[PDB]
Design a protein around this ligand. Structure first.
Ligand SMILES: Oc1cccc(-c2ccccc2)c1O
Ligand SMILES: Oc1cccc(-c2ccccc2)c1O
Ligand SMILES: Oc1cccc(-c2ccccc2)c1O
Ligand SMILES: Oc1cccc(-c2ccccc2)c1O
Ligand SMILES: Oc1cccc(-c2ccccc2)c1O
Ligand SMILES: Oc1cccc(-c2ccccc2)c1O
Ligand SMILES: [Fe+2]
Ligand SMILES: [Fe+2]
Ligand SMILES: [Fe+2]
Ligand SMILES: [Fe+2]
Ligand SMILES: [Fe+2]
Ligand SMILES: [Fe+2]
Lengths: 288, 288, 288, 288, 288, 288
């Protein structure tokens, strides 16, 4: 059973721009370079985000974490039984990722996915942010979330819920012009309101954005100014209707956006699926 | 599995009187008019109470909420297996109710019931009461409760417990004159002491009253004076023996009564069924 | 410096009616009979209320407590310097009151007052109420309060503030008919919002009422029903605008009223004098 | 599944002595007389202890509480399957006990037992103790506990654990003289450390003692003095090794003893069975 | 200004008996022998109790602690102005006591007293009790208290309050036979209810007893059994009416008694002087 | 199901050196000598560590605790089904261990193991440490942990996880020289991060060390100095990367080391297996 989103890798055209963006603007910690690419940290894990040179300028792969080897075995079986082509990552890949075991495959629309267990911790190299950030919220909630753009939401849903086991949190009917309303589906696999959202948006990228959650309002406020100085803000500060996260959006060097937020509410046993007609209570004025 | 009472609809002869009563006396928020009728809010949901023009001057339908589509499917099966005629609400009805999916049917004595999932939230339109009320208590406890008057309590019980899944909280043997004692059964489907009560009272209505719970004693005290000014109080302030709610009762424009209370105790895993001979510890002096 | 109202004595025509009223209706503990009269307890003190046979059917004396002998000395001096006739109570009176030392005198309009120190505690005879009452609130706030009716409020004020040291909490302009508005002054000598109130009401008694504060809302609710059964309620349940006490009023056998309340707010260092035009937020409907 | 010990009935030769003992010494509330005998209360339940005239001067019956009718049904089946003669109490017995439904039977050595559901609550008649007691601890822990004397502990154990479902807490090897060591078994059916203890002691009675738990140390201290005044103390104040209860023991008018205690520790999921060689850490000096 | 009772010294005929009594029965820590005598600890201070060989078998001296050198200077002046013969302790005495500075004198009836500042701490030699005791309560409340027997209470009072600065807490009128009532005065110099009590009892000793306060009820219970084993208990467990301390009394090898207690209430700014007719709520049965 | 490590026994060449080491350096309580050897306590249990005369100078046996007789039965079956030779300990062995029932067997590499239930508590003999220690942390976490040295980690793992039921917490790849990296596996059976660790180290002993956890940082600091005085420290103070325990290591008289720590983090339901490349965040400098 998937416990959380553990890591993500980006294939970008300008690695230097990304390095500077992630550390100086967002405050991530530079963790060195390896055959896994330029590594970045936000907590005790050896790395959470990897940046590799590439032409797509998009998310290259995402890794989902299971608790142990038994969990890995369950998932591999679930995928096989579903007719998905799964590959047991070899020792070489596992060493490159810094994990104990992993299986690889792709989602229905070609996004490379990895499910692994036993990632590396580096408590002996205490996290020191590249900019003034009090802390990032990970723990049992994992890395954060990302919005997967797909040509067919229903096909994507069946795969993520029935095969991968994500559960629906809620749906937002996004009005994109008078003759267009696109439902966005928010899915959770732990307490975090959503670790994955699915929507059929007309974008050239695999994801609309990825999100990182910080510990205080000031972390968000200071980061906003740092990003704003370079004219990279895409949405003003606002609060979402569904997860109640206070956040802003900005452009990364690849065009893909990043959401930087604070104070999201979690999902619990009493949770019930609901629908919304707006993605924000207040703010989030688009300045794109 | 039913999680809570989600909404109620009334068919009344004087819609204007109801509108004024609900907002100015009870403090509900007027949420507009649609083909679903005049809508009223008490929390983040798009509506909780609907008022439609009608001759019965009574509860027209009640909607029970399940967590998701799987829950809806379970309930539909449970009802079918019980031999109840169930109808999958069409897109038209679902849109009118502002829900994602719903099934319709009736209780053994003709009360139209609906079980649905995926209701609409409107966090972007913050709740503002029509009168000074600090807040209403809903959340996982749902809307509140109502007392269903029936000609046969045993038949009603078998349906609500065996088919709908409500659990018994307790029983109160209500003394209505020397040669008459009527047992009232209190049922729960979540933490709220009771979401439904059943009693064979000789009333022309489907329900004796519906109840709304507020956040503070002052909310109740101020509302009492507002209602008292128009001579609509039916029972003075008092506290119930079973749910320990402090409340008063008043007449709505349809003759059906409304209970307005505060500070009820909840049901938990350690709960055991008990019986009482009185419905009130103190107060609740009838002034009908 | 006066720390609190410590005890009160009533001279009544029907001692038996009072005994029954105080214990069975209000829940005080019967503490025996002495040359000080029938004694009643509400806490650890040997007695707080004394009932003696008398024709006035009114408050006979009130005792204010100082911390020690030095405090008693200060007060005696303050009174002498003000030209008030003060008498050092003899050993006989002190023994009758169960106190260590006391001085006697009268207010400007003839109410016998006593200031004392070193009252008797009886922790070895645990308080057991005459009716179901969870507890009375005394402690550093003393016995409670009473409203002193006077022919001249200004003269009364100068005496109670300048000579006795009480401080003003607030004022309520009580509308008694179109051509009559009477200001009621509320005074404190400790945290209790008011230990004494002064008003020029046209009543035959020295006080309008005395007040006792209980620990829970149920104490008030149950007591209301007990009193209501005998038709003695004078005001329905309500909450005051100034002290925020939730209470009801009832008639004692002497015509003097008693207020029984719960949840009053206290006075602190940040307190500022204010004025009100109403004595109640809600309730307190007169049924006299 | 048995949730707790709900009530007990005693058949005694001197009902008046018992009435006075329970109210004046222990502080129970006298709840009237019925065909169920003299009734006594310690909480919201209509009665917990019944005293009937009888020659045995011992426990006459004990009632164990289940949560509902389904629970009653389960227990009846469990007993039947075990070959125990069970009788469904008739409406007459149920009305006498003030319960909704009950089954009767006897333990292996003739103690009449009853399992019931739906007892009567009397919140409208607030508990008022017969002596100064802050409160008794019942709730989900039930009435308290009693020690059942049996000729064969192993046979008794098999019945109480395998048939009735009690679980072992711990065992104390009680040294009764050089050539005699008797194991006492402590059993729980809820959080209370033990609701029942079994030991093969050479006593003429069915039980060694019953225990009532109070809310504060002073409740115990004051009760000790009240009992001591009549020379009824059998063990000085002490604390048990297993439940950590601070208590004293005294003789009731029937010779059966009563334990009056405070501050016992509870049993939880992490609990493991252990053994002790002493029943007390300190105190509990026998003065029999 | 005196902050607390800091240390005490006893001159006894059997030093070995005292050593064994203090460590094995009461749980004090043996801190070595010096020219100050056998030293005992109860906290971080180098010593709190000193035992020297002597014929009086009584308290030999008591030391009161001031905050600093200025405080010492104030006290010396206060005493001189009162006409008391004060001696500035020489370096030899100060070194023997392990203090920075001290003055010596005697109370009106010959008890040698010392006021000092700058006592020695020994945090590097962690306190380890001689018996199982969770801890002693000292801190800002100092060592504990003792009852000074005097031939004239009034003369003693004037000295302790007017000259030494102690404040009265309360008075207990101790009934010693029909024709004898002796008032006992309880004085405080900090939060501890009383650090000194004065009474004109007919005893051969300078003090009736000294008291040590422990951290838990078990400390008291276990100590009671240890002392009881040697037949040294003088009063059973009980709770005082004035300080609400739960304690027992026992005989030391010198005849002087020791009180060992727990859970006393403190004195605060709202405190008022009161009187009692009994020294105990419950217990404290004399077995002398 | 194994609940915790309950006790351990050592067979040593110098019993006197061990006695002195455990009490004076580590602060354990000497609990007497029996046919079970010299017994030592750290909490309410009659003994936790036994020292017997022997030539191996190593761990002689370890006892794992189950909750009851049913648990013992389950384990015996699990072992039999695995083909392990299990022996039901006779009454003689059970009495020697002070337990109710036990089974004996050996791990794959000859370490004698015992699984038991119903150990002896001695609350009547309060724990008093041999040195100043505020307390040891046991409870539901049991005794502590030990590192089992084995020639084949994989064979050891299969036995401890598949047969005994321990669960993996994490793995640390211990670098022992350039051409050697040894994985150490940490296993838990309750909240304690690990009760057992397995590693293929080249040591002559069955275990590398055993660990005892204390209640405060000062307990560790003071113990460090006591041990350091005799030159027995093997690792300076440091904090582990996996359990976050702050500790030091020292040599026992048998060469086997002991870890003395404080403040370890626990394992919960959200726990996921991870890997580390270092066993310490800071400190733990080897001075061997
Ligand atoms: O965290 C979130 C919560 C709700 C909606 C969005 C969202 C915004 C823009 C496009 C797609 C989704 C989101 O990111
Ligand atoms: O909330 C409640 C709790 C207990 C009884 C009633 C009740 C009152 C009148 C008629 C029927 C039931 C109630 O409303
Ligand atoms: O506690 C109180 C607070 C405010 C007003 C009154 C009051 C009521 C009637 C007559 C005079 C005063 C009062 O009693
Ligand atoms: O609560 C208790 C805890 C432990 C032992 C006893 C006990 C005492 C005497 C005889 C039998 C049992 C007990 O009552
Ligand atoms: O702590 C205490 C509180 C109250 C009274 C005493 C006392 C007892 C016996 C003789 C003198 C005083 C006492 O010690
Ligand atoms: O508690 C612990 C946590 C992590 C590693 C060790 C360890 C140290 C040395 C050798 C083997 C293991 C340990 O003891
Ligand atoms: Fe987002
Ligand atoms: Fe109701
Ligand atoms: Fe008042
Ligand atoms: Fe007992
Ligand atoms: Fe004392
Ligand atoms: Fe370790």
């Amino acid at each position: 059973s998937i416990r959380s989103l553990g890591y993500m890798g980006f294939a970008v055209s300008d690695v230097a721009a990304w390095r500077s963006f992630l550390t100086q603007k967002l405050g991530l910690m530079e963790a060195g370079t390896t055959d896994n690419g330029d590594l970045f940290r936000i907590d005790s894990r050896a790395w959470r985000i990897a940046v590799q040179q590439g032409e797509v300028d998009d998310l290259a792969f995402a890794g989902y974490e299971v608790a142990d080897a038994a969990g890995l075995a369950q998932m591999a079986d679930k995928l096989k039984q579903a007719g998905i082509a799964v590959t047991t990552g070899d020792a070489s890949l596992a060493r490159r990722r810094g994990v104990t075991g992993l299986i690889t495959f792709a989602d229905p629309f070609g996004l490379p996915l990895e499910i692994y267990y036993g990632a590396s911790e580096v408590f002996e190299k205490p996290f020191l942010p590249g900019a003034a950030v009090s802390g990032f919220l990970t723990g049992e909630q994992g890395l954060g979330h990302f919005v997967r753009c797909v040509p067919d939401s229903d096909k994507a849903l069946a795969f993520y819920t029935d095969v991968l086991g994500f559960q629906l949190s809620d749906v937002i009917d996004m009005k994109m012009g008078p003759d267009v309303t696109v439902p966005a589906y928010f899915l959770h696999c732990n307490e975090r309101h959503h670790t994955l959202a699915i929507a059929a948006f007309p974008l050239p990228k695999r994801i609309h954005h990825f999100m990182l959650e910080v510990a205080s309002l000031d972390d968000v406020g200071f980061a906003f100014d740092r990003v704003d100085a370079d004219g990279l803000i895409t949405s003003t500060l606002g609060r979402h209707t569904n997860d109640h996260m206070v956040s802003f959006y900005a452009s990364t060097p690849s065009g893909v956006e990043v959401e930087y937020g604070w104070s999201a509410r979690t999902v619990d046993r009493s949770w019930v699926v609901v629908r919304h007609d707006s993605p924000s209570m207040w703010g989030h004025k688009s300045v794109r």
